[PDB]
Amino acid sequence: EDALRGFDALMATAGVESTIVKHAASGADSQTLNDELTRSLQLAHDRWGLGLLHLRHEARLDRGEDTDVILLVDGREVARLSQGAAAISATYETMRAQNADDLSDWGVLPEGHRVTLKAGNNQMRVLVEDARDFETHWSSERGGAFVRTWRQGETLAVEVHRPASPGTALAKAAWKAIMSIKDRNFQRELMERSNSVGMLGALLGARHKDAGRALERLPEAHFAVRSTVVRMTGGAQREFDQWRSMVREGLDQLDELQKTTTRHLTEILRH
Amino acid sequence: EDALRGFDALMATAGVESTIVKHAASGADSQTLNDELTRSLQLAHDRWGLGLLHLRHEARLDRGEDTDVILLVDGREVARLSQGAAAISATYETMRAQNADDLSDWGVLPEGHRVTLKAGNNQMRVLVEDARDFETHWSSERGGAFVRTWRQGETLAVEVHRPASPGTALAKAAWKAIMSIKDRNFQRELMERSNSVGMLGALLGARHKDAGRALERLPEAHFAVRSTVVRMTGGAQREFDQWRSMVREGLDQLDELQKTTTRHLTEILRH
Structure with missing residues (x-):
């Protein structure tokens, strides 16, 4: 029964408007349900930013009962939702790797000479205009964000992420939930307790918890949203102006989405 | 040597523009220096809101060396600044008393029938217009504040305080100082540590402290600003409209001052 809501909560960690409950009860074709799951999962991963973009993430339904949702990588069973979110997190953690900095060391395209951008400006104009495949190293974008870009065939893509x-x-959602209490005496008491237990600790103590009894069961506890990818397949792929436009779009979506997730998080913080 | 700066820091806990260093080095008359100290201290106390308004707070300089500043109550020596701020705090705490609620139980005027306002509206219009002395119990003002008022002779006064x-x-100044870092990686690291040590703990760890080494020495650690009093002696004392105006003024000053102290606090948080 409960697998649908699990997956929806998982997706909800990112701006993923899952409607699986509106089709699982509609008798939708199993292959179309799986297809939609998979597209949702892949988008989710673009948002989470694990640097696992080099993999095929697929999601399936089970045939037996109690019907669960299988997470697969490259057609191999990896996890199931019934394992709880934390296990899924650790599973994905064993997959991720980080370089000398707190950044993914992987790269998207099959291994082999990722572009050492170094410095320069017309550095990439050549690549957008006149190049088959390539992928850049991370760009230390000054605006508190790191970005890289690649193209595969007729598809051009950029990702941006902030280390989160x-x-x-x-911390953000909890401080914001404390500010949204609108009960200065109770708020005062919880702020005073935060001095020793942090924002989250105080908020947990307010709801008759010992160490986040329901917290550990809920997804948002781990793998927050920290990245986004903008991609286009189509003539404009080499326009370059389109490329700056993608970058702008990506920054805008990153900021909007992480603020949106803080909003939803803060919301559930007060229930 | 160091007494001047101690007192100034003490006063700085509240919007008290002490200039004692500009007169102690000017050879100002000792009685005028003491007088100014005393007026400053009394204002400070109006701001702190200990419900000790029934006392005479006076401040003196010492004749010997190393010349210190004496805090007196009703002409008796109570504390000296060289004792550190925390001791002064505990001293004042032994003096304060709280009722069934987290409010001062004392009242300003000599004891005896503080006005049980209860309910009613023309309740007080009589008192402003046609009454010698009186003082109300606390009014549970809906706007997240508690207020009471009294008059002594030709002087009419109102105080407002929020329980703080x-x-x-x-907590406020520390969260605000974390947000003012403008270094998302370092900020990220400190926010992550806040999860277990609170905002202040993280900020202390960033400055090579074990438990706030210099923190305990600085005043702002205790007795923050939580109250303000507006008083007038003069014809308008019975105008009543003037009374609403005082109330408005008091709320405005309370909010402005506590925000100002958070500003200065946050400022020193990043040094």
């Missing part, structure tokens, strides 16, 4: 952590997501 | 604590002051 569910803990920063929770 | 230096810890709430520090």
Whole structure:
């Protein structure tokens, strides 16, 4: 029964408007349900930013009962939702790798000479206009963000991410939930307790918890949103102006989405 | 040597523009220096809101060396600044008393039938217009504030305070100082540490402290600003409209001042 809501909560960690409950009860074709799951999962991963973009993430339904949702990588069974979110997180963590900096060391395209951008400006104009495949190293974009870009065939793509952590997501949403209390005496008491237990600790103590009893069961606890990817397949792929436009779009979507998730997080913080 | 700066820091806990260093080095008359100290201290106390308005707070300089500043109550020596701020705080705490609620139980005027306002509207119009002395119980003002008022002779006065604590002051200023870092990686690291040590703990760890080494020495650690009093002696004392005006003024000053102290606090948080 409960697999549908699990997956929806998972997706909800990112701006993923899953409608699986509106089709699972509609008798939708199993292959179309799986297809939609998979597209949702892939988008989810673009948002989470694990640097696992080099993999095929697929999602399936089970044939037996109690019907669960299988997470697969490259057609191999990896996880199931019934394992709880934390296990899925650790599973994905064993897959991710980081370089000398706190950044993904992987790269998207099959291995082999990722572009050492170094410096320069017309550096990439050549690549957008006159190049088959390539992928850049990370660009240390000054605006508090890191970005890289690649193209595969007729598809051009850019990703942007800020180094984040569910803990920063929770600090923001928890402080914001404390500010939204609108009960200065109770708020005062909780702020006073935050001095020793942090924002989250105080908020947990307010709801008759010992160490986040329901917290560990909920997804948002780990793998917050920290990245986004903009891609286009189509004539404009080499326009370059389109490329700056993608970058702008990506920054805008990153900021909007992480603020949106803090909004939803803060919301559930007060229930 | 160091007494001047101590007192100035003390006063700085509230919007008290002490200039004692500009007169102690000017050879100002000792009685005028003491007088100014005393007026400053009394204002400070109006701001802090200990419900000790029934006392005479006076401040003196010492004749010997190393010349210190004496805090007196009703002409008796109570504390000296060289004792550090925390001791002064505990001293004042032994003096304060709270009723069934987290409010001062004392009242301003000599004891005896503080006005049980209860309900009613023309309740007080009589008192402003046609009454010698009186003082109300606390009014549970809906706007997240508690207020009471009294008159002594030709002087009419109102106080307003919000129940506060230096810890709430520090939570606000610390979160605000974290947001003012403008270094998303370092900020991220400190936010992550806040999860277990609170905002203040993280900020202390960033400055090579174990438990706020210099923190305990600085005043702002305790007795934050939580109250303000507006008083007038003069014809308008019975105008009543003037009374609403005082109330408005008091709320405005309370909000402005506590925000100002959070500003200055946050400022020193990043040094």
